[PDB]
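Q: Predict the assembly, please.
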Amino acid sequence: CSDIWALQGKSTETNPLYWLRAMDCADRLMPAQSRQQARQYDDGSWQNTFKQGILLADAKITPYERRQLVARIEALSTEIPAQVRPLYQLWRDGQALQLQLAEERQRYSKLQQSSDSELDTLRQQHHVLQQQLELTTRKLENLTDIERQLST
Amino acid sequence: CSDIWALQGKSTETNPLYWLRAMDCADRLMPAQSRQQARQYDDGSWQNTFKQGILLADAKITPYERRQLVARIEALSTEIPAQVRPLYQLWRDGQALQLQLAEERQRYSKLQQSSDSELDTLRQQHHVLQQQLELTTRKLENLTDIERQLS
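A: Predicted assembly structure:
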């Protein structure tokens, strides 16, 4: 399961059972191991690119880094063997859904942000107005009471 | 790409290539044709539950429908052959993520509602007060003017 990463050749590249074992092995690795193992596959081939994507997927990577990975492998979508495509597609879909999840997380916090600064601003003005109204009202009452008493 | 759903046996059910094909053959059916196939595999065995999952997954189902489909397959994870486990996990995770995206979509609409609700209520309460201050100021400016006439 450590020797699986070093396998190359057409009989491996085109082999869905190989990639499935890779994905399996990837999931047994701690984030730091994943990153270290991934550094060894820099050659820029689709095989290495795909391996990098598999290893780094659960390596506690930023939504930005993930978007970078997905982009690199999607650019070599034509290079993925016909036997592998269905497996690749399933994996790629998972990554796409995690990026959509990242967006929706960001989009939510943005709404939580702007709507809270709006509320805090308005409730600030409302308190200021509550105070302004009390003072003016009390003045009016006070003068009115004096003027009522004076005229009688 | 047909009768693939019919194929059963130990040889078949431990071949990730079979299930990987089933997933490829599920993505070629209309929701009606999927539901018809899905109805034929309802005995509650892991083979059947998994086939059902694969068939309904992309058969234009609702988040509610999925939140059920998800709970079923996650339960029979222990009966899945080791060879097939990584393929199942990958497929399960896809469904779980779709459910998570649905919950967040609803979460975003829940906050967009209650944020607009709070800001509408307070904006109205603020409007009522601004008017109240406008009326008070005038009544005050009346008494001011009257006493500052000497006529």
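The two ends of chain B are 104 Å apart (CA to CA). Residues 10-105 of chain B form one domain.
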